[PDB]
Amino acid sequence: LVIWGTDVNVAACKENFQRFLQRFIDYMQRLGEINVIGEPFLNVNCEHIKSFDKNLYRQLISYPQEVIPTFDMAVNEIFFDRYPDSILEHQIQVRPFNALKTKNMRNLNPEDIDQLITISGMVIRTSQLIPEMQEAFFQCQVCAHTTRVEMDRGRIAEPSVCGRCHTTHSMALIHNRSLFSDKQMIKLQESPEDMPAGQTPHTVILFAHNDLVDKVQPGDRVNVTGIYRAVPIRVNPRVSNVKSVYKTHIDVIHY
């Protein structure tokens, strides 16, 4: 019937939320202005639907790396069929907006390895735009023919595995479909709501990867709902040894 290894239903919303979309209408002007303006990053709010059924809400906080992309295709399918003469140059990514205020922001247990969290703090330091290296292509020397092997969709090509022949960045840099991303080093500052001043405040390294960079000014209010991540820190570049402690870092998904 279906493979349950990824915990993914038929769009997870076809029988649950897509019919709600044609049921929720029964403010036209407010939802329709999305089409006219052509502004990406849909900014849905905290799901009050969760009070009736948790399962709908619980599947967008368990495996968000494999669920948020799913919402993107669902939005486009209706939008293309309804308004084919719209701005198709900008792909639209659904992003939660003002999600559930996580209780005990300081007390983040490592149990929530990959779950949405909401931090509330300030911005201290910001870094200049930094690109990030990803999979590239090589240069053949046989009959001058470009052979596609990994072009076919369906495979998972994670980066950092094939960092060889960087000379490709001199000539074929544009043609490799390797548009570098943007990252901004950001250091949040916990604001414990006028705590009696007991323990020290926890710093969290914020490293937004999306193209939303710089829209956050230093020293402001923080309503950043993000996705927790953990990566292993190399002990020394000279060796391959890896220590059994991981650094916290949070990806921003928010307007």
């Binding site: 490592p110 149990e111 390895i113 994670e158 991540r229 953990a230 990566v231 402690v245 991981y246």
Partner: peptide, 14 residues
Amino acid sequence: RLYLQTRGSRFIKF
């Protein structure tokens, strides 16, 4: 060729 993942790994506090 295998790729390390942090999804289902067990983590404990330290």
